[PDB]
Design an enzyme around this catalytic site. Structure first.
Site, PDB file in Angstrom:
ATOM      1  N   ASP A  48       0.827  -1.194   0.000  1.00  9.74           N
ATOM      2  CA  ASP A  48       0.000   0.000   0.000  1.00  9.74           C
ATOM      3  C   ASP A  48       0.878   1.267   0.000  1.00  9.74           C
ATOM      4  O   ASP A  48       0.339   2.366   0.129  1.00  9.74           O
ATOM      5  CB  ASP A  48      -0.903  -0.021   1.229  1.00  9.74           C
ATOM      6  N   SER A  50       3.064   2.270   2.364  1.00  8.29           N
ATOM      7  CA  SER A  50       3.560   2.688   3.650  1.00  8.29           C
ATOM      8  C   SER A  50       4.873   1.927   3.910  1.00  8.29           C
ATOM      9  O   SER A  50       5.217   0.963   3.213  1.00  8.29           O
ATOM     10  CB  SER A  50       2.542   2.358   4.684  1.00  8.29           C
ATOM     11  N   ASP A  52       7.389   0.312   7.215  1.00  7.44           N
ATOM     12  CA  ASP A  52       7.554  -0.047   8.619  1.00  7.44           C
ATOM     13  C   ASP A  52       8.955   0.335   9.065  1.00  7.44           C
ATOM     14  O   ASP A  52       9.928   0.124   8.322  1.00  7.44           O
ATOM     15  CB  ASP A  52       7.383  -1.530   8.804  1.00  7.44           C
ATOM     16  N   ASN A  59       4.403   1.319  11.518  1.00  4.75           N
ATOM     17  CA  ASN A  59       3.936   1.651  10.181  1.00  4.75           C
ATOM     18  C   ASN A  59       3.608   3.131   9.962  1.00  4.75           C
ATOM     19  O   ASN A  59       2.923   3.755  10.791  1.00  4.75           O
ATOM     20  CB  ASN A  59       2.771   0.742   9.891  1.00  4.75           C
ATOM     21  N   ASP A 101      -4.427   0.337  21.573  1.00  2.50           N
ATOM     22  CA  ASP A 101      -5.431   0.622  20.573  1.00  2.50           C
ATOM     23  C   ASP A 101      -6.577  -0.376  20.402  1.00  2.50           C
ATOM     24  O   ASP A 101      -7.433  -0.179  19.538  1.00  2.50           O
ATOM     25  CB  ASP A 101      -4.658   0.821  19.261  1.00  2.50           C
TER      26      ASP A 101
END
EC number: 3.2.1.17
Length: 129
Positions: A48, A50, A52, A59, A101
């Site tokens: 995608d 992005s 890490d 990320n 989260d």
């Protein structure tokens, strides 16, 4: 910096990760092992777009800003390069937000596939902690 196993366990303990949100220290060392092989400078690009970053492969789509991930949220409010430091404090602080989260350490794919449900205590055995 490529950390030694017991060296990283002691730095993670000092920074408050042992039993942070219920996850014992062996979980965090196991995750670092399989995410980055204990190398603070590790980076890996995803499909995608992005990337890490660092010891715990955080990320850029959600957690840090690298200037090239469209619609990045930057929730840890740091540049992603801060996560590559020999000093792990920014990685630990951001990891604490991530594990809080909702999905816990399942946020780390190498932890779910290689550490979850194994004897993670083995990762800190022999260490002076």
């Amino acid at each position: 910096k490529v950390f030694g196993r017991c060296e990283l366990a002691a730095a993670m303990k000092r920074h408050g990760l042992d039993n942070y949100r219920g996850y014992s220290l062996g979980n965090w060392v196991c995750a670092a092992k399989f995410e980055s092989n204990f190398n603070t400078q590790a980076t890996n690009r995803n499909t995608d777009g992005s990337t890490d970053y660092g010891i715990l492969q955080i990320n850029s789509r959600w957690w840090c800003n690298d200037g090239r991930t469209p619609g990045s949220r930057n929730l840890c409010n740091i540049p992603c390069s801060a996560l590559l430091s020999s000093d792990i404090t920014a990685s630990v602080n951001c990891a604490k937000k991530i594990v809080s989260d909702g999905n816990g350490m399942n946020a780390w794919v190498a932890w779910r596939n290689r550490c979850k449900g194994t004897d993670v205590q083995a990762w800190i055995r022999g260490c002076r902690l």
